[PDB]
């Protein structure tokens, strides 16, 4: 359910959010860690989601991990920076949910349940399975199958989710995508 915020034609100071949190990871693909903050571009997109810091390996530019295929992805062509950080908990503004959840399996199960072809989400799109899934997964490896009507397209549409659980403190994942523009680079930091 990665919350998505898009910022257009606005000057900024990304440090204000980072200083409030305690950052543990800042990987910038195809760009320098501060190059995105130092140089200014057409638009900036920021995503925030309940993602465990512990699955650091699962979040990667290229990985065979479940999130890449189903939970979340970033455009390869555009430079992408991912921030793994932690709220101090001094602020009471952000409260905590039950437990972290991720989609381990999203696939085109056939009307037979023999041959299976996986459904891989592209960048910038919510998975088709997430519409069937709710907000949190109650039990480990919960699988949801929705009866499909001919108008829907028929066949079997299935979804699955897996338990992660959460520590006292909150671990969050941030996805940043930066777009260059011909002249409209107006989103910027005697």
């Amino acid at each position, epitope marked *: 359910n990665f919350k998505r915020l898009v910022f257009t034609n606005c000057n900024y100071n990304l440090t204000k959010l*980072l*200083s409030l949190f*305690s950052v*543990n990871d800042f*990987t910038c693909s195809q760009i*320098s*860690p501060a190059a995105i903050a*130092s140089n200014c571009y057409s638009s900036l997109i920021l995503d925030y989601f309940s993602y465990p810091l512990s699955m650091k390996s699962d979040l990667s530019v290229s990985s065979a991990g479940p999130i890449s295929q189903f939970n979340y992805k970033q455009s390869f062509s555009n430079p992408t920076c991912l921030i793994l950080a932690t709220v101090p908990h001094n602020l009471t503004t952000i409260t905590k949910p039950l437990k972290y959840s991720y989609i381990n399996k999203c696939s085109r199960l056939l009307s037979d349940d023999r041959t299976e072809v996986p459904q891989l989400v592209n960048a910038n799109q919510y998975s088709p399975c997430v519409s069937i899934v709710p907000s949190t997964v109650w039990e480990d490896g919960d699988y949801y199958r929705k009866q499909l009507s001919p108008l829907e397209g028929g066949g079997w549409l299935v979804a699955s989710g897996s338990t992660v659980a959460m520590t006292e403190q909150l671990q969050m994942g941030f996805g940043i995508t930066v777009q260059y523009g011909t002249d409209t680079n107006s989103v910027c930091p005697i």
Partner: antibody
Amino acid sequence: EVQLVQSGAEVKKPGSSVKVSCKASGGTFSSYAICWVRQAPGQGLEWMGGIIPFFGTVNYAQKFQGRVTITADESTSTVYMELSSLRSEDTAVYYCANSYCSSTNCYRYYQNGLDVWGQGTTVTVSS
Amino acid sequence: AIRMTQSPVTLSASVGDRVTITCRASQSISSWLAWYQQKPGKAPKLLIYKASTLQSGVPSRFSGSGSGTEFTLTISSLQPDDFATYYCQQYDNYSQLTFGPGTKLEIKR
């Protein structure tokens, strides 16, 4: 060629407050990350407090958590480590190290190499 | 959650003798464990970074190899300048850079 200069040796009292300044040059101020470590005399090295100056984000060791506050001024390129409730155990030498500067060939803000070190300050605690 | 155990301290190696030191992480850092050489009474010096590559200007073919929790540091030829206290740093997920206890290196006689 990053350059680090640290304050002179300071003698203070337990329950006082200590402010040590780490000054840097020879590398982009926004790109470097300053990490504060304490070496107890005749003891294993320990790390207390890691701060990125431009982001201003601060992470502290669990043992020293809530006892050390680090503030960095980008304009003066000075990083200040503040410790209160001084104890006999605190007496030691303090080293600040700037990770390899990015803007060209890095993407974990540390990655290649990381740490250059400084002259260090010997803080002595006397009641 | 993170703790470091180093090779037995005070390894006994004479000059020209291979030195092997191994520090084990509590969990699977996998790709991040720099090796630091500390001269007594002075500032530390960088050695092998990520335990995969030598820092520019480090001679003597300092060799670091391994994966996950296990990491190793081998010096094929020992020199008087080489003898120093050696530490290892765990980085990435920078919630707590935990320096290793360290191993002293001394001439054997």
